[PDB]
Design a protein around this ligand. Structure first.
Ligand SMILES: *[C@@H]1O[C@H](CO)[C@@H](O[C@@H]2O[C@H](CO)[C@@H](O)[C@H](O)[C@H]2NC(C)=O)[C@H](O)[C@H]1NC(C)=O
Ligand SMILES: *[C@@H]1O[C@H](CO)[C@@H](O)[C@H](O)[C@H]1NC(C)=O
Ligand SMILES: *[C@@H]1O[C@H](CO)[C@@H](O)[C@H](O)[C@H]1NC(C)=O
Ligand SMILES: *[C@@H]1O[C@H](CO)[C@@H](O)[C@H](O)[C@H]1NC(C)=O
Ligand SMILES: *[C@@H]1O[C@H](CO)[C@@H](O)[C@H](O)[C@H]1NC(C)=O
Ligand SMILES: *[C@@H]1O[C@H](CO)[C@@H](O)[C@H](O)[C@H]1NC(C)=O
Ligand SMILES: *[C@@H]1O[C@H](CO)[C@@H](O)[C@H](O)[C@H]1NC(C)=O
Lengths: 107, 48, 125, 243, 303, 38, 107, 49, 48
C-alpha cells in the first residue's frame, strides 16, 4: 500500500513566517498528492493538487512542491487565517490515503 | 513534381489522406503530363 | 532572489575597506552591478558601474582612483574597495541590481536592491 | 529521460540530444493526455510508430505560452526569428505541456532566458549563445551600459500567478531526417521469417513494397545495402537478419 | 611543392549496387588533374596545420607505417570541440575531447564520444557534411616512389561517425624517431561507370574540359563523330549600377509616428506621402513596435 | 537622356569532335557571339 | 552631463490628497526616468519606469507621465503608508544621476 | 456567447467535454459511450485514479 | 498566368521565397505549357 508521513506533526509560527510541511510517500507516486486545509469544526478545503499545482481561490502564499516520494507545502508569509490542520492526500491508487495531519497554530 | 517525395508509397505511407491528396495531386498532374507528351511524340513519329 | 550587502561599520579616516554584495536567486553573471551611497540625511548618489563580466568598470568623478569595485562571476559576488576614507565618505551604501522591466519598452531600470550598509568614517571609538 | 528531464535548457541555448540505433516506440509515448500541443507536420502522428528513420533529433527548451504556437514551420516572431528557426520543409513535430508544476516556484523565476533582438535573423537550426552586446547603429560601445547598447538576453519573469499565456510551457521538438540510408531507428514491430520464390508483400528495414523474392548470384560489396536498377528502381536488398 | 592528382579521388557516393550502369552524380569530389600540395617527411621540415574545407583528400605514400593520425579542430587548443583519430600499433582510436594540443603535436616512436578498434597508398577522403563525419579509404600497393600513380581506384566507405562541428583546420600525426599529399574537394558533377560487379572502373568530370562536358551530355564514355550542343553561354553582368532619381527631401513619416492627436478609428487620418525619399529601414529599426506583419512586400526589402 | 537596352550576348555552346576512338582533339563553337566576348 | 531637478524639494499633505512631483531633466531624455520610493531606514522600491509606466504590485493610485525634459509622478489619493522620500532616476546614459530627493510627510 | 443565460453565479457544471477516447472520431458520429478510459496499462474496472 | 505579376523580377523582388514559390510555380507551369504547345506546333508543321 501507500503510506503518508508528515513532518512536523504540528507546529506554531508567527505571522509572516515561511512554514514548510513535508509529506513522504511509501513509494514513488510523484504526481498524485493533494494538500487539504481543514479548519477545526469545518470541512477540509482543497489547496494543492498534483503536489505542486494551485487551486483557484487559494491565496498565492500557499505553495506546494515535490515528486517521487518527497513532497512539501510552503507558505511564503503566514497570515492570521492560515492556522489550521493540513493533510497531504495521495491519489496514486486505491485505497487513497492521507497523512497524519499537520496543525498550524499561533505562538 | 513539386511534392515531398517521388515514391508514391511514401506519401501514402507516412501522411494520412486529408493532406495526402494535395501531395498526390501534384504527382498525378506531373506524371500524367509526362505520359501525355510521350504519346504525342509517338503519334507524330508514327506518321513519319 | 536575495542580495546580501555587508562590510560596513566604524572605520578610521584615511583607511581602506572592502564591501560585499552577495548575489542569489538569478543568473548574476548576466547583469551589471552598481554601488550607490546615501549619506545620512541626504539623498542617493550613484557611485560605480561594472560590466556583467567586470571587464568594463566605471566610477563617478567623486570616487575615481580611490574606489575599486570588483566582480567574481565564478562565485557571483560583488565587492568595493574604498581607499583613503574620509568624513565625506561616511554614508550608507546600496548595491542594486541592473536589468530591464519584465520585457520590452526600452529602459534599463534599477530593480531589486540590497538592504544597506553604513560606512562611518570616524576617528571615534 | 528527455521527457522526464529535470533541467530543461533555456530557449537561447537549447539542448540537442541525439537519438539513433534504437527501437523507438512513439505511439505509447504520446498516448498520454499530459501533452497540450502535438501538431505534426511532415508525418501524420499516428503513423509515427510504423516508419523507419535514419536519425532523429530531440531539441528541448522552455518558452511562455504565446510562443508555443510560434515554434512551427514557416513562422515568424521574437523567439521564432531569434531563438529557434524551423526550415519550411521541416519533417517532424513539436511537443508542448506546461510546467507551472515544476517552474516559477513562488517569487519570480529568473533562470530562463529570452535572447531578444540580435543584429540579423537567425538561420534554421542554430543555437546562438553569443550574448556579448548589441550595437544599434549609433556607435558608442564596449562601454557596455544603457543607451542603444541593449543587452540581448532578457529573462522570463515566471510567476505562479502569471495568467495562462505567460506560463512556462516546456517544449521538445522532434525532427526526423529521412533518407535512403540504413535506418538506425524504427518502430517496435516484430518480424516474420522469409518466404522466397513467391509473390509476397515485403518490408525490409522499412523500405516497403511487394515482389517475388529470390536468391541473387550478384555479389554485393560489404558496405552496400540496396541494389538499384538502371531505371533507378529497387531490385535487390540485403536481408537484415541474415546477410 | 605541387603535383598532379591525375585520376585518384572517386569514392562510392552512396549505398547502391549499379551493374554496368553509367550513373551521373553531383557531389564533393577531387577535381581531376588538380594541384595537390605535397608535404615531405625527410631530413628539418614539419607537418604544418593545414586549412580544412568542405572536403579534404589525403593520399599518403607509406613505406614504414610512420603516419598514424589526423586532427580536426576549430581552435585545436582545448577552447573548442576537437576530434582526434590515431592508429597506434594495433588499435584505432577516435576521441573528441577538447584536447590541449602541442604546438608540435607528434607521436614519438568536457570529454565526449569515443570508439576503439614506397609500397603503399593509404588514400583517404575525409569529408564532413550535414553534421555527419565520413571517412573513405583504399590500400592500393604501388612501386613508383617519386610521385602519385596514374590509374583509377575507387574508394570504399570505411567508417561514418556523428560529430557535427565546424572543422576548419587540419593537421596530421607522424611517428617520430614518408611524404603525404593534400587536395581539397569541390562540388563537381561526375559520371561514374559501374562495372558488372559494381567496382567503379572509370569516371569523367563533367566540367574538366570541353570534351568531357559532351561525355556527360551524351551520357557515354565514347562519343561518335559529330557536333554536340552541350551548354549555354552567358555574359555575366560585371557592374551593377544602382541608379535612382535625384531629389532630396525626407518623407514626413516622423510626424505621423511622433503625432500627438491620433484620430479615432471611425474617423482615421489619411495623410498622403509622395514625391520624397522614404527610408523605411531605419524607420522600423526600433523594438517599440509590436506588430509589423506585411502582406504585399517582404518587410526588409522596402528600403 | 534616351537610352537603349540590348540584352547581353548569349548563345549555345556546340562541341566539334571527331569520334573519340580516332582522337581526343576538340574544337568548340560558340553560337552567335563576336570573338571578343569569349 | 544630465542633471535632475525636483520640485518641491519636500512637502506635507493629508490622506486622500492628490500629490504631484515634477522632475526636469537637463536635456531631452524622454524615455529614461525612474521613480523610486524609499522609506527611511529601508531600501528604495522601484515605482515607475520609462517615466510613465507602472511597476507591478504598486497601488494604482500611483501614476506617472511625461517625456522630453518634463516628468511627473502623481498619486490620486495619498494613503497613510505613502509618506516617504521619492527620487526620480534617469537612465538615459552613464553616469546615471538622481534628483535631490523629495520627502512627503503628514500634516 | 451565452453568459446571459449560462454560468449563473457559481460554476455551471451541466455541460460536458468528452476528453480523450481510444481513437479519433469519424465525421458526424455522436458518441455517448462513457464506460471508462484504459491508457495502455491493463488495470481497469476498479475505475478510479 | 493567374499570378500576381507576369514579370518574374517583381515576384522575385517583392516577395521572399516562402510565398514566392506558389506564385512562381504558377508562372512556370503557364510558361511551360506555352512552350510545350509551340514545339508540338513545330513538329506537326515540320512533318508537312
Ligand atoms: C566556425 O568557426 C569559424 C572561425 O574559425 C567561424 O567563422 C567566422 O564567422 C564569422 C561570422 O560572423 C566571421 O566574421 C569570421 O571572420 C569567421 N572566422 C574567420 C577566421 O574568418 C564560423 O562561423 C564557425 N561556424 C559557424 C557555423 O558559425
Ligand atoms: C598547378 O600549379 C602549377 C605550378 O606548379 C601551375 O602552373 C598550374 O597552372 C596549376 N594548375 C592548377 C589547375 O591549379
Ligand atoms: C593507443 O592509444 C590509446 C589512446 O587512448 C591508448 O589508450 C592506448 O593505451 C594506446 N595503446 C594501445 C595498445 O591501444
Ligand atoms: C565545459 O563546458 C562548459 C559549458 O558552459 C563551459 O562553461 C566550461 O568552460 C567547459 N570546460 C572547460 C574546461 O572549458
Ligand atoms: C566479379 O568478381 C568475381 C570474383 O568475386 C570475378 O571473378 C569477376 O571477374 C568480377 N567481375 C568484374 C566485372 O569485375
Ligand atoms: C575503336 O576502338 C577499339 C578499342 O577501343 C579498337 O579495337 C577499334 O579498332 C576502334 N575502331 C575504329 C574504327 O577506330
Ligand atoms: C565584332 O566586332 C568587330 C568590331 O570590333 C567587327 O569588325 C566584327 O564584324 C564583329 N563581328 C561580327 C560577327 O559582327
Amino acid at each position: 500500500d501507500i503510506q503518508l508521513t508528515q513532518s512536523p506533526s504540528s507546529l506554531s509560527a508567527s505571522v509572516g513566517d515561511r512554514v514548510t510541511i513535508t509529506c513522504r510517500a511509501s513509494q514513488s507516486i510523484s504526481s498524485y498528492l493533494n494538500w487539504y486545509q481543514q479548519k477545526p469544526g469545518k470541512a477540509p478545503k482543497l489547496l494543492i493538487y498534483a503536489a505542486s499545482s494551485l487551486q483557484s481561490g487559494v491565496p498565492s502564499r500557499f505553495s506546494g512542491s515535490g515528486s517521487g516520494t518527497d513532497f512539501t507545502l510552503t507558505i511564503s508569509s503566514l497570515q492570521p487565517e492560515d492556522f489550521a490542520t493540513y493533510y497531504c492526500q495521495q491519489s496514486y491508487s486505491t485505497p487513497r490515503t492521507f497523512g497524519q495531519g499537520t496543525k498550524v497554530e499561533i505562538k | 513534381f513539386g511534392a515531398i517525395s517521388s515514391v508514391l508509397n511514401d506519401i501514402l505511407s507516412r501522411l494520412d489522406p486529408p493532406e495526402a491528396e494535395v501531395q498526390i495531386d501534384r504527382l498525378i498532374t506531373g506524371r500524367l503530363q509526362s505520359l501525355q507528351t510521350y504519346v504525342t511524340q509517338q503519334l507524330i513519329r508514327a506518321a513519319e | 532572489v536575495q542580495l546580501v550587502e555587508s562590510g560596513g561599520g566604524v572605520v578610521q579616516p584615511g583607511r581602506s575597506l572592502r564591501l560585499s554584495c552577495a548575489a542569489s536567486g538569478f543568473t548574476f553573471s548576466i547583469y551589471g552591478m552598481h554601488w550607490v551611497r546615501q549619506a545620512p540625511g541626504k539623498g542617493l548618489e550613484w557611485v560605480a558601474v561594472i560590466s556583467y563580466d567586470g571587464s568594463n568598470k566605471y566610477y563617478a568623478d567623486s570616487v575615481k582612483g580611490r574606489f575599486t569595485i570588483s566582480r567574481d562571476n565564478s562565485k557571483n559576488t560583488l565587492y568595493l574597495q574604498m581607499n583613503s576614507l574620509r568624513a565625506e565618505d561616511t554614508a550608507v551604501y546600496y548595491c542594486a541590481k541592473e536589468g530591464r522591466p519584465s520585457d520590452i519598452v526600452v529602459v534599463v531600470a534599477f530593480d531589486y536592491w540590497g538592504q544597506g550598509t553604513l560606512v562611518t568614517v570616524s576617528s571615534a571609538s | 529521460e528527455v521527457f522526464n528531464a529535470t533541467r530543461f535548457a533555456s530557449v537561447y541555448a537549447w539542448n540537442r540530444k541525439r537519438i539513433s540505433n534504437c527501437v523507438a516506440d512513439y505511439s505509447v509515448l504520446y498516448n498520454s493526455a499530459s501533452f497540450s500541443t502535438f501538431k505534426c507536420y511532415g508525418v501524420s502522428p499516428t503513423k509515427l510508430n510504423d516508419l523507419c528513420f535514419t536519425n532523429v533529433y530531440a531539441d528541448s527548451f522552455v518558452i511562455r505560452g504565446d510562443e508555443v504556437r510560434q515554434i512551427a514551420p514557416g513562422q515568424t516572431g521574437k523567439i521564432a526569428d531569434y531563438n529557434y528557426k524551423l526550415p519550411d520543409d521541416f519533417t517532424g513535430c513539436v511537443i508542448a505541456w506546461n510546467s507551472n508544476n515544476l517552474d516559477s516556484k513562488v517569487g519570480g523565476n529568473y533562470n530562463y532566458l529570452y535572447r531578444l533582438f540580435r543584429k540579423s535573423n537567425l538561420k534554421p537550426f542554430e543555437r546562438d549563445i553569443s550574448t556579448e552586446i548589441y550595437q544599434a547603429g549609433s556607435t558608442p560601445c564596449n562601454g557596455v551600459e544603457g543607451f542603444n547598447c541593449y543587452f540581448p538576453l532578457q529573462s522570463y519573469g515566471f510567476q505562479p500567478t502569471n495568467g495562462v499565456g505567460y506560463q512556462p510551457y516546456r517544449v521538445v521538438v522532434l525532427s526526423f531526417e529521412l533518407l535512403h540510408a540504413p535506418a538506425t531507428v524504427c518502430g517496435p514491430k516484430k518480424s516474420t521469417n522469409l518466404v522466397k520464390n513467391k509473390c509476397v508483400n515485403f518490408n525490409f528495414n522499412g523500405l516497403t513494397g511487394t515482389g517475388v523474392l529470390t536468391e541473387s548470384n550478384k555479389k554485393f560489396l560489404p558496405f552496400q545495402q540496396f541494389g538499384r536498377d538502371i531505371a533507378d528502381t529497387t531490385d535487390a536488398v540485403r536481408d537484415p537478419q541474415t546477410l | 611543392a605541387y603535383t598532379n592528382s591525375f585520376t585518384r579521388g572517386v569514392y562510392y557516393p552512396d549505398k547502391v549496387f549499379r551493374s554496368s550502369v553509367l550513373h551521373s552524380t553531383q557531389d564533393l569530389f577531387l577535381p581531376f588533374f588538380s594541384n595537390v600540395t605535397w608535404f615531405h617527411a625527410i631530413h628539418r621540415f614539419d607537418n604544418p596545420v593545414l586549412p580544412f574545407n568542405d572536403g579534404v583528400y589525403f593520399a599518403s605514400t607509406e613505406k614504414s607505417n610512420i603516419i598514424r593520425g589526423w586532427i580536426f579542430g576549430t581552435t585545436l587548443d582545448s577552447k573548442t570541440q576537437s576530434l582526434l583519430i590515431v592508429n597506434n600499433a594495433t588499435n584505432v582510436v577516435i576521441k573528441v575531447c577538447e584536447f590541449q594540443f602541442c604546438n608540435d603535436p607528434f607521436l614519438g616512436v568536457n570529454c565526449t564520444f569515443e570508439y576503439v578498434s614506397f609500397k603503399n597508398l593509404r588514400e583517404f577522403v575525409f569529408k564532413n557534411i550535414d553534421g555527419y563525419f565520413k571517412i573513405y579509404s583504399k590500400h592500393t600497393p604501388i612501386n613508383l616512389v617519386r610521385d602519385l600513380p596514374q590509374g583509377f581506384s575507387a574508394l570504399e566507405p570505411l567508417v561514418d561517425l556523428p560529430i557535427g562541428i565546424n572543422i576548419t583546420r587540419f593537421q596530421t600525426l607522424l611517428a617520430l624517431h614518408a611524404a603525404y599529399y593534400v587536395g581539397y574537394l569541390q562540388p563537381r558533377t561526375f559520371l561514374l561507370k559501374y562495372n558488372e560487379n559494381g567496382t567503379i572502373t572509370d569516371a569523367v568530370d563533367c566540367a574538366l574540359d570541353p570534351l568531357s562536358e559532351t561525355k556527360c551530355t551524351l551520357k557515354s564514355f565514347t562519343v561518335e563523330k559529330g557536333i554536340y550542343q552541350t551548354s549555354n553561354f552567358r555574359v555575366q553582368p560585371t557592374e551593377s549600377i544602382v541608379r535612382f532619381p535625384n531629389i532630396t527631401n525626407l518623407c514626413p513619416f516622423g510626424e505621423v509616428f511622433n503625432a500627438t492627436r491620433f484620430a479615432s478609428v471611425y474617423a482615421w487620418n489619411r495623410k498622403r506621402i509622395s514625391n520624397c525619399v522614404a527610408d523605411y529601414s531605419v524607420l522600423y529599426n526600433s523594438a517599440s513596435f509590436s506588430t509589423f506583419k506585411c502582406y504585399g512586400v517582404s518587410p526588409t526589402k522596402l528600403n | 537622356e534616351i537610352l537603349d537596352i540590348t540584352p547581353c550576348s548569349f548563345g549555345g555552346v556546340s562541341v566539334i569532335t571527331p569520334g573519340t576512338n580516332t582522337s581526343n582533339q576538340v574544337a568548340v563553337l560558340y553560337q552567335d557571339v563576336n570573338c571578343t566576348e569569349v
